[PDB]
Amino acid sequence: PRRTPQSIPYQDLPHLVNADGQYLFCRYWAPTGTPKALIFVSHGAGEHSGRYEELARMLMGLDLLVFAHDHVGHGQSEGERMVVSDFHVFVRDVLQHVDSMQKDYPGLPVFLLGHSMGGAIAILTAAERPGHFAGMVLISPLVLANPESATTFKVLAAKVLNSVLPNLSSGPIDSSVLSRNKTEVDIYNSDPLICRAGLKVCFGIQLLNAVSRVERALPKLTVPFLLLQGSADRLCDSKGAYLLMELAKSQDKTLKIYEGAYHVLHKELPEVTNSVFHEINMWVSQRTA
Template sequence: MSTVQNDTKFIKTKDDKKIFCKHWFSEEKPKALIFLCHGLGVHCLWYDDLAEALVNIGFYVFAHDHVGHGQSEGTHNHVNDFSEYTSVIFQHCDEVKVKYPDLQLFIFGHSMGGAIALLAATSQPNIFQGVITSGPAIMATPGLLVSIKVFLGKILSRVIPMFKIAHIQSGQISRDKEQVKRYEDDPMVHPYIRVKWGAAWIECVKKLEERMDSIEFPFLALHGDADSLCDVQGSRMLYEKAKSKEKELKIYPGFYHSLLLEPEEDRKRVQTDILDWLKQRIE
């Protein structure tokens, strides 16, 4: 097992926003590349454990805080369109690919990051050689969807786009109380949904629904069946509609939303499933 190194830096978007990036690697030449795509209100530093495990099986791992998240510039939890997320991913991936042009590139996305990962992969179908989603936000729970639609129906996304219409309850992310407390105590976590973000997310979901039956890239979809934030039916729909020859769906009974923050034995099981799926593609 090689020593995992890491570095951090900022890149600038085309509209001049500073984006915080983190890369994990070892001295050995990597076998493949993977981008880690975090969820709404959190940031990329939550993925150190997964990143280190990925480096140890031969990956060069990189991630950034989405615009308006963590240490990146932008209004917290706000975009007009999800292309503001995907454009930075393409930019970051292009920069890494310059150094490693011949290596396969994968993407992992959790929650909102799962929706972003799928949006990116369906926008440029040849860029990623595999996609992993964890509790992707590609179908809302009924209550959340109704809340957003009521506000959107009153055109509040134009009048008060920054208005917070919903808060993520920390107890919904994990059954592990230590991880919930860590989430609550992190000053860079902003657990709420704004009206305009909700409108942008609904547009993203519509695009994904339209593109789902044309998906052909390999993917692994992971979801807890006790996820009260992102409906498990979204992952089932993805698996059923996609035309991919290599596709796998794993549903974990009783698991909450953040699979990699569940109690230790359970999150290790999820991490092992991720590593095994990737190993099959790079060895």
């Protein structure tokens, strides 16, 4: 029988088979009553859906049915770790899961929540289905990568794109730039389901594709969104958040800047994280009443 990369049979776990025949591990948090809306949680590179337990439980407490899967190559889903044939695979698979849930739960509004790479996936998902999503919550979405990281990575990308170098990777990122909360950093460094290895160059190329595709999608984006961004973000440059606010056509767009905060706002210092949870709670509550 088919098993996760951690040797657990998929028959023992919630799952979905994607269009490429790959098993995706799924998570669900459903309220005891009739849901007011559905919301898909889109995780970022290297991590997995289990990192969203507390946010998901908050949203479920608002009577939303929260659902997620581990993207291909991540967590408990299948696929060579941190490989993707094309970035759109992630978007396609989100859409499959959304479409499946909308059948089981017809007539409900559907929201997207995405962090980091998962925020770029959310943007591209909404841009593919204009008018279909009720709203998007973006936590430091990948709109522009760190300019310094992008420049040096593009040099590595040149080698892989001009030669046959299938194993080339970037150096690992220093986990301390992910959050000022050292306990959250230590937890991230301890989770066996998180891939903390240096980025394979082929995957980083797909992140460059994500950035290019987000740029082209902005003038089409009309979905309501809440955008949360730290001013000291070394992964997704804050300039991308300002550009998203300026270039999206959405009539309902709000930006909250957390001064001094690092990339992972929902795992930051308690004052930041508590505010992040409260702001998402209010924004979703106002749009599901």
